Amino acid sequence: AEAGITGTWYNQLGSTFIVTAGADGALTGTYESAVGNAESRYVLTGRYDSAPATDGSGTALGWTVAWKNNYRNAHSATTWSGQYVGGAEARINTQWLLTSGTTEANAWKSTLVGHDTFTKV
Amino acid sequence: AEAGITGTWYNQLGSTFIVTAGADGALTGTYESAVGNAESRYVLTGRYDSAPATDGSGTALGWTVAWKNNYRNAHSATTWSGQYVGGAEARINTQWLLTSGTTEANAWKSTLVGHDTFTKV
């Protein structure tokens, strides 16, 4: 993990995320959407659990992206919760929650749920 | 449970659901939306687990409602997963998933997640 997590990750749609996993459990980086234009880039911050077990378990982690940058304000945020699996074909499998700010009458439609798998390729 | 589940349940918004929990784990009934007009009523079908434990555990259950009736076709379905707790103040606590049929490009926004608590009052 840590060293293994640092790098570029891609999901089944093309989104790319670049992270630096620091010594003490911090995750910092950027997420970029499809197209890959200068700034479809947003800041991501998360944490990972830095002393994972030794039975081949995955490394639990999660991160958040607020969909606001200098070109777009989507008034929403996504959190990804999952684990990193290293090896020949390392991957991070996640489940995510995307919440949009709504009025109290529309709060029922405020959170979408999905899953993403990221690979180094 | 079973006898305890059968009856009318209301959630924090006013929705009402009426179920009959049958001897062999079946749940059948109707769900009605706010307003409570003749047919804001949809059919619900589910299952509950009929021989629950004796340490005060809740009774696991779930049901589905397809949002189509003779007045409306919302092209969606909701599933509620949770447990029934009996007693002075019995309640069913659930987490739900509402999926809308989308095209493959919009599948990412197809499922909303939320929670509901139902009481007899």
Partner: peptide, 6 residues
């Protein structure tokens, strides 16, 4: 479409 995607 949403930035998470496009």
């Amino acid at each position: 479409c949403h930035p998470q995607f496009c």
